[PDB]
Design brief:
EC number (chain A): 3.4.-.-
Number of domains of chain B: 1
Bound molecules: 2-acetamido-2-deoxy-beta-D-glucopyranose, zinc ion
Oligomer: heterodimer
Membrane topology (chain A): Single-pass type I membrane protein
Shape of chain A: globular
Order of helices and strands of chain B: HEEEEHEHEEEEEE
Helix content of chain A: 55-70%
Strand content of chain B: 15-25%
Protein name (chain B): Spike protein S1
Order of helices and strands of chain A: HHHHEEHHHHEHHHHEEHHHHHHEHHHHHH
CATH architecture of chain B: 2-Layer Sandwich
Organism (chain B): Severe acute respiratory syndrome coronavirus 2
Radius of gyration of chain A: 24 Å
Number of helices of chain A: 24
Strand order of the largest sheet of chain B: 1-4-10-5-3
Catalytic activity (chain A): bradykinin(1-8) + H2O = bradykinin(1-7) + L-phenylalanine; apelin-13 + H2O = apelin-12 + L-phenylalanine; angiotensin I + H2O = angiotensin-(1-9) + L-leucine; [Pyr1]apelin-13 + H2O = [Pyr1]apelin-12 + L-phenylalanine
Strand order of the largest sheet of chain A: 1-2
Helix content of chain B: under 10%
Distance between the termini of chain A: 68 Å
CATH superfamily of chain B: Spike protein, C-terminal core receptor binding subdomain
């Protein structure tokens, strides 16, 4: 009857050997970019997918309507899904060359300064620096246009061939396009009303965006106001924020405008970087602090291999390395983090995030191979960030010693904090949703390539409230100048995650019985909250993410309510700030171009 | 009985048996110092059943049996009385009435190579469960289905398996060396006796 259990048992035990091989090869590339390690990655990928092909067909022979063990049924459906195995031979290696090329371009691209043409400079470390400090419109603009001109233009033809092949693979897996393959992460088969069909996600996103939209709009108007004080003639009081004037090299997080936009500047600082600078922190201490936070709640510390094999400093070996922060599960209790952590508060919180990934991976290693994932892409990211929400409260910052101890508590500093929080949480929601929506369109065939950037910037201006400084023809491929786009990572997770968070924290704060505002809650030294969360990280993808949600929060779907309630004091203040302001943007004026 | 029992050389041994085909050496006629065992001291499990690690060197027994093999970290919990899992079900099962000691120490720098030590194996498929101290070194293709079989085909699996042993594996998949000591009271003179009796 169920020779399924048996087949799955042989599969688990080979697939994890082979997936560790592939993961090691990819790691050895991501921390040492050479021609040789690039090819050793290709060969590991070839063996993985040649294997997964036979195992996939072999599984499609077991009818899934005879399986009654929903556990084995989820496993068999995961495996009857032939990702990659869908593309074949020439087209699996073609894809892989395209993918390697995009990847090494993104992490080797250097742009030079018209002023000192001998100064070519990399993104992963240096151009990031410029985009985080500078307040010189023309400096920022040459870095922004130089990056898009000198890599996005190199990536355009690649992104095209990439889209045809990724779509072919999806169609071969019975999906409308690649965007339907990625939205299939949110598809769940349980009972009662614990099911979820892919095509709900777009509705459920567009619902919640609307509910988020008012708050974003107010934050937007205010940020424009303050930005007008630093760039008077380049910004209209009724239109859009220029794309090269935000926190980083895209409009992704507005967390480097805190300086320009701090509500009550004469108070204790929520950003705490200066403190670390003088407190002589380093990479190892940031991670030892993340580790302490997770133990404080009752989770495992980190493995020895985590310390002996991870990349925490950017290597000073001459080695060329892809620096974007990532948390690796190489399938064998072999966990690592690949991050170029610099001594700032932003890296300190992202060490929280990527270690939250490692903790999830450790959590569900009790599950069989095919079920060791998150319940959905969002949950994995969300978990990284729930801890962050607590790691970031002033109260904890004070406990760390990074704040000055003295008690200058007041709504004043709560407004300071809520704004530094809005700049990174709320700010990223329209940018995120708009980026994924552009990709979903490109996959579904709705954008002719003669109008790619035309429909990029149009959606930009319309949905984010952000306009571009110089005009871009279809020789650009701006969207691909982000790690996730050119390194083939689904992006709507960073949307669902931001909502799922306040649903989790709220629940995990009810457990700690924290009274008062959800934004002053801190789950440190709370073993019962840690227990509440670990019980569901132990599930992984073995149960419907909808039930997984109810297990801790009591919802079967997303719910903007906790997010909105967390930011409610900032909503009230921000609204006053924009009583004599237009709460909105218009795509009419431009910045000369 | 003045010669000293060769417990050292079960432990001191370049290569261990694969759990499926676990070894046995019969300690017979000597004085029994459990002391040498700590020349491999860093121990991940040292569990006695019937006697006490702190009372060896006083054990008078007719015979001692030393069974040795290599296992995953995870799987050491299975070398216990009454335990269930692949290693106890198809490789190495112990009696419920076990008097003895399971001894288990990490062996990465020896048994794990950067390219997989595939010279280690375990039996992942068997028609039914081994009985205590049973041992089975078949390589017949397991037949999962009602249907007939062929070589490593479908519904028809090769019965054994190999642990990839590589240094960067997390601790639960690293190779561990295991030694089960079995203490045998027979009705005969007790000729494996300790320094302190
Ligand atoms: C990096 O890669 C080169 C060639 O691909 C290899 O020979 C070398 O050992 C690597 N260096 C390390 C491991 O740091
Ligand atoms: C489903 O199968 C698993 C093994 O794959 C087993 O542990 C579990 O008890 C089964 N659940 C049932 C029969 O409902
Ligand atoms: C958790 O306990 C530690 C140990 O005393 C303390 O330093 C820290 O402030 C506590 N966390 C809080 C109060 O958030
Ligand atoms: C084990 O004992 C024998 C006794 O002659 C010795 O030759 C051998 O070197 C020992 N093993 C090690 C690793 O020293
Ligand atoms: C197994 O028994 C043989 C018998 O000659 C012995 O030489 C070998 O060292 C043993 N291997 C182990 C320690 O499992
Ligand atoms: Zn992440």
């Amino acid at each position: 009857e169920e020779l399924a259990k048996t087949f799955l048992d042989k599969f688990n035990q080979e697939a994890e050997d082979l997936d560790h091989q592939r993961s090691l090869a990819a790691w050895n590339y991501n921390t040492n970019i050479t021609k040789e390690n690039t090819e050793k990655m290709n060969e590991a990928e070839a063996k993985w997918s040649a294997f997964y092909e036979e195992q996939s067909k072999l599984a499609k022979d077991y009818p899934l309507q005879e399986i009654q063990n929903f556990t084995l049924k989820r496993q068999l459906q995961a495996l009857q899904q032939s990702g990659s195995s869908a593309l074949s031979a020439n087209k699996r290696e073609q894809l892989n060359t395209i993918l390697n090329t995009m990847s090494t371009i993104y992490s080797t691209g250097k742009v030079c300064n018209p002023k000192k043409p001998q100064e070519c400079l990399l993104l992963e470390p240096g151009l990031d620096e410029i985009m985080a400090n500078s307040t010189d419109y023309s400096e920022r603009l040459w870095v922004w246009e130089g990056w898009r001109s000198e890599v996005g233009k190199q990536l355009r033809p690649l992104y095209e061939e990439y889209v045809v092949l990724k779509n072919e693979m999806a169609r071969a897996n019975n999906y409308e396009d690649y965007g339907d393959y990625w939205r299939g992460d949110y598809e769940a088969e349980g009972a009662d009303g614990y099911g979820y069909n892919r095509n709900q996600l777009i509705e459920d996103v567009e619902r919640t965006f609307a509910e988020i939209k008012p708050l974003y709009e107010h934050l937007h108007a205010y940020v424009r106001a303050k930005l007008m004080n630093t760039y008077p003639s380049y910004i209209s009081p009724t239109g859009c924020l220029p794309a090269h004037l935000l926190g980083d090299m895209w409009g992704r997080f507005w967390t480097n405008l805190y300086s320009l936009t701090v509500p009550f500047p004469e108070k204790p600082n929520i950003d705490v970087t200066d403190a670390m600078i003088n407190q002589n922190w380093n990479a190892v201490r940031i991670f030892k602090e993340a580790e302490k936070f997770f133990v404080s709640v009752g989770l495992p510390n980190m493995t020895q291999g985590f310390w002996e094999n991870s990349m925490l400093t950017e290597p000073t070996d001459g080695r060329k390395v892809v620096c974007h922060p990532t948390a690796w599960d190489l399938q064998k209790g072999d966990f690592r983090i690949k991050m170029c952590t610099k001594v700032t508060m932003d890296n300190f919180l992202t060490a929280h995030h990527e270690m939250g990934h490692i903790q999830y991976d450790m959590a569900y290693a009790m599950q069989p191979y095919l079920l060791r994932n998150g319940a959905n892409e969002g949950f994995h990211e969300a978990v990284g960030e729930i801890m962050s929400l607590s790691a970031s409260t002033p109260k904890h910052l004070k406990s760390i010693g990074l704040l000055p101890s003295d008690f200058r508590e007041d709504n004043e500093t709560e407004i300071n904090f809520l704004l530094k929080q809005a700049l990174t949480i709320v700010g990223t929601l329209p940018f995120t949703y708009m980026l994924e929506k552009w990709r979903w369109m490109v996959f579904k065939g709705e954008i002719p390539k003669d109008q790619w950037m035309k429909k990029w910037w149009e959606m930009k201006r319309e949905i984010v409230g952000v306009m571009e400084p110089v005009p871009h023809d279809e020789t650009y491929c701006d969207p691909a100048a982000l790690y996730h786009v050119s390194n083939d990572f689904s992006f709507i997770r960073y949307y669902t995650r931001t909502i799922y968070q306040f649903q989790f924290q709220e629940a995990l704060c009810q457990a700690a019985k924290h009274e008062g505002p959800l934004h002053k809650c801190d789950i440190s030294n709370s073993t019962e909250a840690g227990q509440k969360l670990l019980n569901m990280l132990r599930l992984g993808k073995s149960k419907p993410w909808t039930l997984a949600l109810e297990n801790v929060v009591g919802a079967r779907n997303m719910d903007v309510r906790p997010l909105l309630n967390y930011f409610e004091p900032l909503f009230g203040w921000l609204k006053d700030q924009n009583r004599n302001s237009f709460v909105g943007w218009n795509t009419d004026w431009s910045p000369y171009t | 009985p003045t010669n000293l029992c060769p417990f050292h050389e079960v432990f001191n041994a370049t290569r261990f048996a694969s759990v499926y085909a676990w070894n046995r050496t019969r300690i017979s006629n000597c004085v029994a110092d459990y002391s040498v065992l700590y020349n491999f001291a860093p121990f991940f499990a040292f569990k006695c059943y019937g006697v006490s690690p702190t009372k060896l060197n006083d054990l008078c027994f007719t015979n001692v049996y030393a069974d040795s093999f290599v296992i995953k970290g995870n799987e050491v919990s299975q070398i216990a009385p009454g335990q269930t899992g692949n290693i106890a079900d198809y490789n190495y099962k112990l009696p419920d009435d076990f008097t003895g000691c399971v001894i288990a120490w990490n062996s990465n720098k020896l048994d794990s190579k950067h390219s997989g030590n595939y010279d280690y194996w375990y039996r992942s498929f068997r028609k039914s469960k081994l009985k205590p101290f049973e041992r089975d070194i078949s390589t017949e293709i397991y037949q999962a289905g009602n249907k007939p079989c062929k070589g490593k085909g479908p519904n028809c699996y090769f019965p054994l398996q190999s642990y990839g042993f590589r240094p960067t594996y997390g601790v639960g998949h690293q190779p561990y060396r295991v030694v089960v000591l079995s203490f045998e009271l027979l009705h005969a003179p007790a000729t494996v006796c300790g320094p302190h009796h």
